[PDB]
Write a protein that binds this ligand. Structure first.
Ligand SMILES: O=C(O)c1cc(-n2cc(CO)nn2)cc(C(=O)O)n1
Ligand SMILES: O=C(O)c1cc(-n2cc(CO)nn2)cc(C(=O)O)n1
Ligand SMILES: O=C(O)c1cc(-n2cc(CO)nn2)cc(C(=O)O)n1
Ligand SMILES: O=C(O)c1cc(-n2cc(CO)nn2)cc(C(=O)O)n1
Ligand SMILES: [Cl-]
Ligand SMILES: [Cl-]
Ligand SMILES: [Cl-]
Ligand SMILES: [Cl-]
Ligand SMILES: [Cl-]
Ligand SMILES: [Cl-]
Ligand SMILES: [Eu+3]
Ligand SMILES: [Eu+3]
Ligand code: NA
Ligand code: NA
Length: 129
């Protein structure tokens, strides 16, 4: 599923990501735009042989099982394919664990380089939330 911007903002808010660990909703929407273009089916392979999955590009090296990242962990205790669903519940619940691990949203490279420090509220401007 390719979400619209406000559609995804509403879903993330309903799932409790607005201000989670102090990160306002616009930070999450910005991160998802540049990680996945709001496409739940996005996948990208990393240099180490892990893969990033879903709207927030969650990595199989640490967070989910894909069966092909030998030596990896599965700290969200989920198959990586759950992160590709049109329902973002699994991606949100796993993201909550990632952003709590000590490094905040720096875990997301696109957030660090394209969202951090910017006017992220612009990403939810005009939405009825
Ligand atoms: O493709 C776009 O740029 C786009 C698409 C949508 N979409 C809205 C929906 C709902 O059915 N799907 N895409 C919203 C926006 C926007 O708020 O700027 N922008
Ligand atoms: O209506 C929109 O949501 C929309 C429209 C355009 N359009 C761009 C052009 C060409 O000038 N026409 N609509 C771009 C975007 C976007 O980049 O999010 N979004
Ligand atoms: O917190 C992370 O997972 C993270 C943070 C950084 N950061 C690097 C800097 C400063 O240059 N800030 N976070 C890089 C990486 C990575 O290569 O996977 N990962
Ligand atoms: O006006 C639009 O169509 C629009 C504007 C932005 N904006 C994104 C930013 C952040 O720099 N400001 N407007 C995003 C989108 C979209 O994601 O579809 N769409
Ligand atoms: Cl929308
Ligand atoms: Cl915001
Ligand atoms: Cl594996
Ligand atoms: Cl393969
Ligand atoms: Cl599994
Ligand atoms: Cl933080
Ligand atoms: Eu648009
Ligand atoms: Eu990292
Ligand atoms: Na906000
Ligand atoms: Na699993």
């Amino acid at each position: 599923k390719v979400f619209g911007r406000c559609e995804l903002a509403a879903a993330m808010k309903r799932h409790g990501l607005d201000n989670y660990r102090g990160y306002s909703l616009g930070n999450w929407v910005c991160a998802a735009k540049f990680e996945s273009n709001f496409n739940t089916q996005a996948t990208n392979r990393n240099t180490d042989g892990s893969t990033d999955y879903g709207i927030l590009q969650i990595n199989s090296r640490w967070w989910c099982n894909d069966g092909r990242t030998p030596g990896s962990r599965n700290l969200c205790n989920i198959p990586c394919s759950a992160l590709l669903s049109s329902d973002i519940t699994a991606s949100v619940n796993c993201a909550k664990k990632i952003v709590s691990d000590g490094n905040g949203m720096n875990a997301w490279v696109a957030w660090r380089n394209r969202c951090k420090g910017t006017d992220v509220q612009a990403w939810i401007r005009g939405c009825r939330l």
